Amino acid sequence: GMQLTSENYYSQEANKEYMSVSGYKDFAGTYGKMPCEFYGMEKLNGRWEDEKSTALLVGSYVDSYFEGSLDQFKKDNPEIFTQKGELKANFKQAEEIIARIERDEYFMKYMSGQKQVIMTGELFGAKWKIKMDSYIPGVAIVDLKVMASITDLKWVKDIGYLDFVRYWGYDIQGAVYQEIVRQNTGEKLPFFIAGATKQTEPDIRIIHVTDNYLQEALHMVEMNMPRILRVKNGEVEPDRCELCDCCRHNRVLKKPISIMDLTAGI
Amino acid sequence: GMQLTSENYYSQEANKEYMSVSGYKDFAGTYGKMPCEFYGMEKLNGRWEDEKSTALLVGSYVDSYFEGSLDQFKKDNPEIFTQKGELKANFKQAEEIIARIERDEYFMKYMSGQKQVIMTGELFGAKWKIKMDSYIPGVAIVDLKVMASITDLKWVKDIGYLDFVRYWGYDIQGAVYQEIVRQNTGEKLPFFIAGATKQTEPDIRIIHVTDNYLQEALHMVEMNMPRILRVKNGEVEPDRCELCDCCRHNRVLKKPISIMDLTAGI
Amino acid sequence: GMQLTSENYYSQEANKEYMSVSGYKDFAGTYGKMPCEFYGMEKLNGRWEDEKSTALLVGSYVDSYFEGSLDQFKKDNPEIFTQKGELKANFKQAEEIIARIERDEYFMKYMSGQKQVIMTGELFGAKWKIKMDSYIPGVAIVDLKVMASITDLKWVKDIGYLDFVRYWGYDIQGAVYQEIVRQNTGEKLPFFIAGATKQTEPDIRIIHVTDNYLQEALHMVEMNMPRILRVKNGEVEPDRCELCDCCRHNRVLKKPISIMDLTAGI
Ligand SMILES: [Zn+2]
Ligand SMILES: [Zn+2]
Ligand SMILES: [Zn+2]
């Protein structure tokens, strides 16, 4: 069993040995992003690395501020600065958001736990790994998210308006995080998202994702994992969504499509 | 009774003594912008000033051109120029729009009235103030608006597609302007919006907002003013929409929300 | 009968003597663009030339690469370069797209025909002209299109979701191209769009637009041409959509509109 560390948590070998919330979503998707098994297998092999995104980089900048690892973050990610030397605007806003969080005592209490805590477990067939933004032992699991909007609802076909937690599958993250802590600690802890937005005056909220929602999502994880396990173990060929950048990079045409192909399925 | 002037019309003390069309909307809102009583009270106190907007600044640039006060506008608003010295593109387009207006005789006739005329009155409980772009005594009240689109319709829930006049509450502006002139002049004058757009060839129109629409909106003003008057006089605590920048700047968290809070109301 | 050439195909006199797929759409429109007869007549007269668009210029850059006329394209279109000398980003992406196409053998086979082939014919009242990106004699007519998306469907009122081919009237282009080749060759050839997208990994597809769709569109052309012919021959005054830049440039106001005018037709 591989001993995971801060340096190696995201490693290729860390990801082969341990399913992760992020791993699962590659295969299973969320309301906001189609599943794609191929994409998930190409990431594992190391034959596809994503172009790093402004949104993710903002969010890691802020994680790094709270962990006290900002100097090294900046060193490892020179693309956050202009050629002239100054932080690009999205990051000057990141500091605006941090200051906004810091002047709220209540919000700062949820951020007061152990920082980037790695834990391990067994679920539905595989070993898993988690890494929690702010963990307060015996009281709460907190995840910081920096997003465009907390209050915006999004339309889902045949379901209707959905809040951001269920839409982006943060119900999945909470469920797994909770359960893995439970296998290490015995304690079943509540899950809170500490949200801040990139609006011009940031919106701040602590959002409790209740155990009824965590339970329904841990169930869905259970239903999908067997198919996932089959694909990761070379036991079946992964499907391609044919709608992601990985799919498009790897396509090799052999036949014409027609209009039927564009309108298939309504 | 305070004697209003061009220099002091928008002053803090001018706004405490006089309700205005803009004042009313802060409290009462339009189809395009939620009401927020708090925002309205923080603007009055002087504890919240809005970040000046490109759209508003374009529009004031054009007002200032027609009043012959452009030199001083430019002096008071240095942020309309690049650091290198040139007018930012939105303002180089503003001059494009002005030239487009100027080559239309018909449009120029509606713009030929007295410029930025201040009048005063009494309505539904308070003193009010108005300031009209182009006033032709005994014939018409004209308001210049520079917008994205004249012809675009916008969907309103349980109402359907709405034209820009009703959607942005310019029916309110017209109604009040008309009535206050009527209390000074005796004459009930028609209200026209002289619209130009920021499309790449600007769309130009003179739009008559008829007295049936003005009447229905002056009615709505009447229904809402008592609640407004209560709030401005410290007789009740103002509600917060919790969806504007003022609300967000001023929020002090004390409790967690949940998904119920995000989906409340459909 | 005017002998058309590469140099003169798009000339004012080439367009008076020959209807073209592009000519037809000016008058008849597509699901994606309102018809406007006036616009069509002002383009013919030479009293309206369109501001050249980034999208069209990208697409011509790529045509020019395959024809071996890129040096001269660049000379004739200096606005594709920054003042500092480098290709603007949209064109650095155009080369990315070209390289992506070139590494696909199947796609390159459809691109292997004669390049920018001009043909002429008679249909429904007028002489017509066509110019085909890649023509393989006795096998296929191929048109290269560089677009935002191949898979995106667009909503059309009282019709519903429509694929890009029918939405933008490429069914019209295919139908006419096919028929004119048939009047020169005797051979009825299949029509393929060789599509590539501007997504960050370009989507590539060969799309066969089948003869049932070409037939329904050649029919619509037939129904609309008499009205078109009347307008081009000065036999009736062209209507103005009043929603395009040409219409707006040419408007001369004489009367006020009202809200009825904005909401006419639902
Ligand atoms: Zn995929
Ligand atoms: Zn508010
Ligand atoms: Zn038009």
Cα separation of B167 and B150, whole Å?
A: 12
Contact A245 C199 (CB under 8 A): yes
Q: What percentage of chain A's residues is helix, strand, coil (to nearest 5)?
A: 45, 20, 35
| Separation in Å, CA of C240 to nearest CA in chain B | 14
**Residue C188 CB coordination number (10 Å):** 11
Q: Are B150 and B207 in contact (CB under 8 A)?
A: yes
Distance CA A12, CA A9 (A): 9
Find tokens 């459809």 and name the residue.
C110
Backbone phi, then psi, for A139, in 5-degree steps?
Answer: -135, -45
CA angle B155, B159, B164 (to 5 degrees): 50
Report CA torsion sign: C105, C107, C111, C112. positive
Count of residues in chain B: 266
In sequence order, what are the residues at sequence separation of 6 or more whose Cβ sits closer than 8 angstroms to the Cβ of residue C219? none
Ligand nearest to the CA of C36: 3
Residue A189: which of A108, A80, A81, A114 has the closest Cα? A114
- Contacts of A among chains (3+ CB pairs under 8 A): B, C
| Chain B residue with the nearest C-alpha to that of A197 | B248
Residues 6+ apart with CB under 8 A from A46: A12
CATH hierarchy code of domain C1-266? 3.90.320.10
Note residues around ion ligand 1 (Cβ under 5 angstroms). Answer: A 36, 39, 241, 244, 247
Q: At what angle do helices B21-28 and B211-232 cross, to 10 degrees?
A: 70
Number of A to B CB contacts under 8 A, please give it.
55
CB of C264 within 8 Å of a chain B CB? The answer is no
H or E element, residue B172: helix B170-185
Q: How crowded is residue A216: how many other Cβ atoms within 10 Å of its Cβ? A: 12
Of B104, B163, B192, the CB nearest to C263: B163
Annotated binding residue at B244? yes
Ligand nearest to the CA of B239: 2
Per the annotation, does B241 bind a ligand? yes
Mutate to test the interface with A, among C163, C212, C214 (most CBs of A within 10 A): C163
Given CA atoms C105, C109, C114, C117 in this order, what sign does their dihedral have? negative
Residue of B nearest to C249 (CA): B201
Q: Residue B135's beta-bridge partner residues? A: B114, B141
A144 touches B253 (CB < 8 A): no
Handedness of CA A12, A13, A19, A20 (dihedral sign): negative
Of B262, B219, B253, B250, nearest to B43 by C-alpha is: B250
The domain limits of chain B are 1-266
One-letter amino acid at B11 equals S
Q: Residue C53 is which amino acid?
A: S
Count of CA atoms in the C-beta half-sphere (13 A) of B122 = 2
> Are A138 and A189 a contacting pair, CB within 8 Å?
yes
Q: Give burial (CB, 10 Å; 0-12/13-18/19+) of C201.
A: middle
Name the experimental technique. Answer: X-ray
Contacts B259 to A, Cβ<8 Å: 163, 165-166, 207, 209-210, 213
Q: What is the resolution of this structure in A?
A: 2.2
Give the distance from CA A75 to its chain's centroid: 23
Instruction: Please state, as a whole number, how many other Cβ atoms lie within 10 Å of the Cβ of residue B187.
Output: 11
* Residues of chain A contacting residue C210, judged by C-beta atoms under 8 Å apart: 258-259
Residue C226 C-alpha from the chain's centroid: 21
Tokens of A232: 């990761």
C-alpha distances in Å from residue A238, one per residue of A41, A232, A253, A265, B119:
8, 8, 18, 21, 74
For C191-240, where are the E strands, in sequence order?
191-197, 204-209
The whole-angstrom separation of Cα A79 and Cα A84 is 12
**Contact yes or no for C103/A250 (Cβ under 8 A):** no
Q: How far is CA A228 from CA A34, A173, A177, A244, B79, in A?
A: 15, 17, 19, 19, 56
| Contact: B256, A165; criterion CB under 8 Å | no
Beta-ladder partners of A30: A33
- Token look-up 């080749």 returns C181
Q: What is the enclosing helix (H) or strand (E) of C234? A: none
Contacts of A51 in chain C (CB under 8 A): 200
CA-to-CA separations, C122 to C16, C17, C20, in angstroms, rounded: 14, 11, 11
Would you say B196 and B97 are in contact if contact means Cβ atoms under 8 Å apart? yes
The strand pair at B114-123 and B126-136 is best described as antiparallel
Amino acid residing at C85: G
The helix or strand, by DSSP H or E, that contains position A253, with its residue range, turns out to be none
Pick the closest to residue A21 from A191, A244, A255, A137 (CA basis): A191
b/e per residue, A218-243, with b = 16+ CB within 10 A? beebeebbeebeebbeeeeebebeee
Question: Residue A25 Cα, ligand 1 centroid: separation in angstroms?
Answer: 13
A247 is in an annotated binding site: yes
CA distances from A108 to A103, A117, B253, C215 (A): 8, 18, 10, 67
| Cβ atoms within 10 Å of C112's Cβ, excluding its own | 11
| Residue B264 at interface with chain A, using a CB cutoff of 8 Å | no
* C-beta separation of B254 from A106 below 8 A: yes
Q: Bridge-partner residues for A195, per DSSP?
A: A145, A205
| Residues of chain A neighbouring B38 (CB-CB closer than 8 A) | none
How far are the Cα atoms of A224, B227, C252 from residue B104, in angstroms, in the given order? 67, 44, 7
B233's tokens: 């006089």
Q: Which residues neighbour B17 within 8 Å (Cβ) at sequence distance 6 or greater?
A: B1, B2, B127
Distance between Cα C94 and ligand 2 center (Å): 46
Supply the DSSP string of B37-95, one letter for each residue.
Answer: HHHHHHHHHTS--PPP-HHHHHHHHHHHHHHT-HHHHHHH-GGGB-TTSSBPHHHHHHH
Task: Name which of B129, B124, B128 is nearest B227 in CA terms.
Answer: B124
Strands A126-136 and A114-123, sheet pairing: antiparallel
**What are the angstrom distances between the C-alpha of C79 and each of C49, C66, C86, C87, C90?**
16, 21, 11, 9, 12
Sign of the torsion formed by the C-alpha atoms of C109, C114, C116 and C121: negative
- For C249, the closest of B106, B201, B209 (CB atoms) is B201
Query: What are the φ/ψ torsions at residue C145 (nearest 5 degrees)?
Result: -135, 130
Give the residue carrying structure tokens 């139908």: C175
Whether the CB-CB separation of B63 and B82 falls below 8 Å is answered with no
Tell me which residue in C248, C257, C262 faces B199 most closely, judged by beta carbons. Answer: C248
For residue A203, the chain B residues in CB contact (below 8 A) are 248
Number of H helices, E strands in chain C: 12, 9
CA of B34 to the centre of ligand 2 (A): 8
The DSSP code sequence of B201-246 is S--EEEEEE-HHHHHHHHHHHHHHHHHHHHHHTTSSPPP--S-SHH
- The residue behind tokens 């999205």 is A90
Of A246, A177, A251, A214, the closest CA to residue A27 belongs to A246
**Residue B62 forms beta bridges with which residues?**
none
What residue has token string 């024809």?
C67
Distance A242 CA to ligand 1 centre (A): 5
DSSP string covering B134-154, please? EEETTTEEEEEEEES-SS--E
Of C107, C163, C210, the CB nearest to A262: C163
Provide CB contacts within 8 A for B106, sequence distance 6+. Answer: B206, C252, C253, C254, C255
End-to-end Cα, chain B, rounded Å: 48
- Provide the Cα torsion A173, A179, A181, A182; round to 10°: 160
User: CA C71 to CA B245: how far, in whole Å?
Assistant: 53
Q: What does the alpha-carbon distance between residue C136 and residue C192 come to, in Å, rounded to a whole number?
A: 11
Is A194 strand, coil or helix? strand
Positive or negative torsion for Cα B50, A108, A181, A94: positive
Which residues, in sequence order, are bridge partners of residue A146? A196
CA B20 vs CA A5, A205, B36, B205: distances in Å: 63, 35, 16, 26
| Spatial contact of C164 and C124, defined as CB atoms under 8 Å apart | no
Does B248 sit within 8 Å of A203, measured CB to CB? yes
Question: Does the beta carbon of C50 lie under 8 angstroms from any beta carbon of chain B?
Answer: no
Question: Are A256 and C208 within 8 A, CB to CB?
Answer: yes
Residue A151 has its nearest CB partner, among B246, B253, B262, at B262
Looking at CA atoms only, how far is residue C22 from chain A in angstroms?
22
Angstrom distance (rounded) from CA A41 to CA A233? 10
